[PDB]
């Protein structure tokens, strides 16, 4: 479960990566 500065985006089929709007970065990692 993400602490949202991060947003839940899936890549087209399966996978979710946590992406932050303020820093503008896509990470596979959960802080």
């Amino acid at each position: 479960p993400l602490p949202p500065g991060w947003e839940k985006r899936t890549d087209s089929n399966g996978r979710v990566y946590f992406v932050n709007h303020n820093t503008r970065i896509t990470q596979w990692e959960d802080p």
Binding site: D11, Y17, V19, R24, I25, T26, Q27
Partner: peptide, 9 residues
């Protein structure tokens, strides 16, 4: 070894 997707909606 995977790339990240770029931040662009």
């Amino acid at each position: 070894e995977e790339p990240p997707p770029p931040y662009e909606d």
